[PDB]
Amino acid sequence: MNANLFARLFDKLDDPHKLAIETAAGDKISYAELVARAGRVANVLVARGLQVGDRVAAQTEKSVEALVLYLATVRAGGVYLPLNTAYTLHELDYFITDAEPKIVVCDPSKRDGIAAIAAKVGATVETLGPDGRGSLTDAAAGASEAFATIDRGADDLAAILYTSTGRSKGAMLSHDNLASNSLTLVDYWRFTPDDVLIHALPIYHTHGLFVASNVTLFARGSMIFLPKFDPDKILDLMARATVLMGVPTFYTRLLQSPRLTKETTGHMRLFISGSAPLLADTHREWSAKTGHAVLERYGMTETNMNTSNPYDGDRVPGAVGPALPGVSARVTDPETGKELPRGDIGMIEVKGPNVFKGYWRMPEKTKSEFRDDGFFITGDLGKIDERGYVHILGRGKDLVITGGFNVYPKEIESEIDAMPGVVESAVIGVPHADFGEGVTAVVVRDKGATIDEAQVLHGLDGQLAKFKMPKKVIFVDDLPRNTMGKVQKNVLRETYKDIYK
Numbered sequence: 012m013n014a015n016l017f018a019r020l021f022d023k024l025d026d027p028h029k030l031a032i033e034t035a036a037g038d039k040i041s042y043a044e045l046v047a048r049a050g051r052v053a054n055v056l057v058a059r060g061l062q063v064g065d066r067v068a069a070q071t072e073k074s075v076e077a078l079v080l081y082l083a084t085v086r087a088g089g090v091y092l093p094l095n096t097a098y099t100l101h102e103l104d105y106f107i108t109d110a111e112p113k114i115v116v117c118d119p120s121k122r123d124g125i126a127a128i129a130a131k132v133g134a135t136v137e138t139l140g141p142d143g144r145g146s147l148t149d150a151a152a153g154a155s156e157a158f159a160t161i162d163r164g165a166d167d168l169a170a171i172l173y174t175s176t177g178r179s180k181g182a183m184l185s186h187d188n189l190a191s192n193s194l195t196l197v198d199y200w201r202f203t204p205d206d207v208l209i210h211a212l213p214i215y216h217t218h219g220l221f222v223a224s225n226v227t228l229f230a231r232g233s234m235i236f237l238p239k240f241d242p243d244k245i246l247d248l249m250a251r252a253t254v255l256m257g258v259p260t261f262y263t264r265l266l267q268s269p270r271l272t273k274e275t276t277g278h279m280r281l282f283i284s285g286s287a288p289l290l291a292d293t294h295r296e297w298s299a300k301t302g303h304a305v306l307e308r309y310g311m312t313e314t315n316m317n318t319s320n321p322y323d324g325d326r327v328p329g330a331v332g333p334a335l336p337g338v339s340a341r342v343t344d345p346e347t348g349k350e351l352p353r354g355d356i357g358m359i360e361v362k363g364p365n366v367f368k369g370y371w372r373m374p375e376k377t378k379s380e381f382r383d384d385g386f387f388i389t390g391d392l393g394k395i396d397e398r399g400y401v402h403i404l405g406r407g408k409d410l411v412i413t414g415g416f417n418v419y420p421k422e423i424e425s426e427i428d429a430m431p432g433v434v435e436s437a438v439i440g441v442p443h444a445d446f447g448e449g450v451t452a453v454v455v456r457d458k459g460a461t462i463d464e465a466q467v468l469h470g471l472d473g474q475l476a477k478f479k480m481p482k483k484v485i486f487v488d489d490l491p492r493n494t495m496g497k498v499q500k501n502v503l504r505e506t507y508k509d510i511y512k
Contacts, residue, residue, distance in 0.1 A: 015163040017086035019190045020228050021046050029204065030233040034075050042231070045079070050158035051151040052083035056114060058154070059135045063088035063161055065113035066171065068106065069139075070094040072118065073214050073238050076143035078224060080116060081170075081214070085186070088161030089113075091170045092181075093215040104128050110171060110181060110371065119145055141238070171371055172217060172312045181371030182312045191364040192315040193225035195336050200281060200306070201322050202230035207252040209245055210234040211261070217312050218285055223256050246270045253280040259289045262305060266296055276301040281322075285310060288403075290435055291328060291428040307331045309401055313387060315365040318401045329425025330400035338363035341386065342395050348382060356394045356404060356419055360386040392419065409500060411440030411448050416478050418450055420500075423481065426474050427452055427467060432460025437490050438481065439503045443511040451510065452481040453503055455489060483510060 012018065027043040034040070040048070056067065067084040069092065071077040084091040092110055094103065103125060107115060111132045117125055119138040129136050138145035163169070165187035173179045196202075208227045212219030227234045235248055242264050245255070255261070262284060265271055282297070282305040289307060297305055308319035309331040317340060320332040334340040338361060342351050345358040366387050369377035380388045393404040404419040411418040420438035427436040434455040440448030456462060464484040471480060491502040 013160060013162055014165045014167070014186050014190070015085065015088070015160050016169050016186045016189050016225075017049070017082055018160050018163075019186075019194075020082075020225070024231070026204070026231065029231065031228065032075055032078075032233060033235045035236060035238050038075075040075060045082075047156040048076075048079045048151070049083040049086055050156040051154040052079055052147065053087040053158045054154040054156075055137075055147065055150045056083060056087050056089065058150075059114055059137065061087055061089050061113050064090065064168070066090045066092045066110050067114045067116065068092040068094055068110060068112035068134075069116040070096060070098060070103065070118065070121070070215075071116060071139045072096055072141035073219075073236075074139070074141060074143035075236055076139055076145075076148055078214060078236070080139065080147065081220065085163075085169045086158060086160050088163060090168045093170075093172065093220060095215050096213075100124050100128070105179070106173060107132060107134065116145075116147055122146075166368065168368070170221075172220075174312055180373055180376065183368040183371055184315075185368055187364055188315060188367055189221055189225060190229075191337065192335075193221065193229050195338075195365075196222065196226045196316060196319075197230045199319055199322065199335060200226065200283070202226060202232060202254075204231040206230055206232035206254055206280070208232060208234040208254040208256065209237065209248050209252045210256075211237040211240045211245060212256065212258075217310065217315060218256065218258075222285075222310070222316065240264075242268055243270075246275055249276055249279050251278065253278065254283070255279065255281070256283045256285070258286040259284055259293065262289060262293055262297055266293070266300065271300050273300070273302045276303060279303065282306065283308065288331075291425070292434045294326065309403060311389065313367045314361050314389070317361050317363075317365065327396070327398065327400045328429040329422065330396065330402045332401065333399040334361075334363075334401065335365075338365055339386070340395060340401055342393065343382075345392070353395055353397050356392060356417075356422070359389045359391045359393045359401065359403070361389060362386040394422075411438070411450060413440065413443075413446045413448050413450050414478060415447070418479050423450070423452065423471070423475065423479055426471055427454060430462060430467065430470050432457050432462040435490060435498075437498050437500060437503060439500050439507070441504055441507050441510060443482070446482075449482045449511050450479060451507060452484045453490065453507070454484055454486050456486055485510075 028041050031042045031045045032040040067089050081091045107128050115129045115134045116137050119140050137147040139147045163186050166185050169186045170184040171181040210223050214220040284305050306320045310316040318332040340361050342357045351357045362385050393402045404421045423438045424436045436454045443449030467484045491499045
């Protein structure tokens with residue numbers, strides 16, 4: 012039947028009156044109520060000139076109404092284009108010009124400001140504020156709820172999400188890209204209609220917009236729709252929720268709370284982290300304080316989710332799990348494009364029903380990033396181990412070259428980080444008359460941890476090829492980090508420039 016994501020989500024409901032969404036104010040919206048809301052908004056969009064295939068660009072603060080706009084856009088056969096709330100009027104000009112949306116929805120504060128930009132591409136402007144009120148909401152109230160969901164095929168567009176070295180690119184995502192991936196995750200992450208997801212992520216990125224929302228809705232579960240992340244509120248809610256999706260900072264911040272215990276997390280079923288790697292130390296602490304594991308998973312705008320750690324059993328250090336059902340992952344020589352033996356490091360490529368359709372109005376870039384056999388070149392370097400787990404090892408800028416051989420610091424860092432007493436390691440290359448660069452590990456230990464330099468080197472023995480062995484292990488109270496909290500390896504290289512003199 013209809014491949015329209017809205018139809019896949021809402022066509023057959025056994026229990027339409029069950030909770031879909033609890034708002035931050037505590038309002039309850041059933042599945043039936045959510046569908047009706049979407050019907051009213053879809054009627055407004057069509058009334059304002061939205062035709063099948065047109066884009067709706069939306070720069071909205073997070074609200075249930077903003078989520079409804081996404082659903083309504085796809086229902087009406089439109090292509091939903093969320094835009095980071097951080098974009099200035101000048102920055103919006105780029106996206107609106109590139110995408111040529113028919114409708115632009117923005118905060119009431121920008122209404123008159125975006126008028127000229129919108130007029131340039133022939134778009135109509137509506138508004139939606141952080142409270143979910145605005146011209147869109149005014150109009151929807153007076154619109155009919157009945158709407159015939161537009162027929163769409165698997166490969167028809169549902170959304171465009173822009174990426175973050177060149178200009179920002181519009182990733183074209185199909186109905187089946189979105190439906191296939193979240194349906195796969197419902198099963199892989201063992202969701203049921205009894206699940207309650209704490210939703211504290213932005214909805215202008217893949218994670219909060221698609222993964223959290225679509226997985227919950229395909230599962231027939233519900234979400235508690237928070238406007239933003241707040242450690243105390245989340246702790247509050249865990250007593251009556253089952254799932255949390257977050258990013259590492261969620262977990263590290265939560266860990267800083269005396270409130271975090273086995274009891275306060277006793278009701279929870281599943282914790283997931285994405286976007287950036289969790290430290291092994293954080294995995295360990297979370298497990299020690301709460302009794303729970305935290306699942307990690309590899310994904311990106313162009314591919315949705317590619318892998319996930321298994322629901323049951325072993326996390327592998329440095330890895331984010333095997334390819335999900337339906338998804339193919341491989342590692343290739345970055346230049347020649349030939350697949351490498353398992354365990355060798357190269358370019359990660361993925362193929363599957365999750366992979367996007369290309370970049371909007373950028374045919375040459377689209378051509379260059381796909382192999383002849385349909386695999387998408389991710390830009391990420393890494394390896395796939397003999398167990399099939401994917402290890403992401405960065406994007407190549409941090410390369411160390413020792414005795415003429417390439418070394419990827421993350422490969423070594425994950426092994427050291429997995430050792431008891433280790434908070435975090437940073438592997439760098441500094442001048443070494445014999446090897447050009449000497450592999451060097453700089454390690455933060457737990458207060459009073461007993462692990463020493465010899466123990467780290469012994470632990471690495473056998474785990475990695477000999478040429479990758481650090482020549483020295485240096486212990487420090489902390490790592491230098493930039494204002495964004497990223498470890499500064501240039502600073503480390505300056506500090507330790509003379510260690511092999």
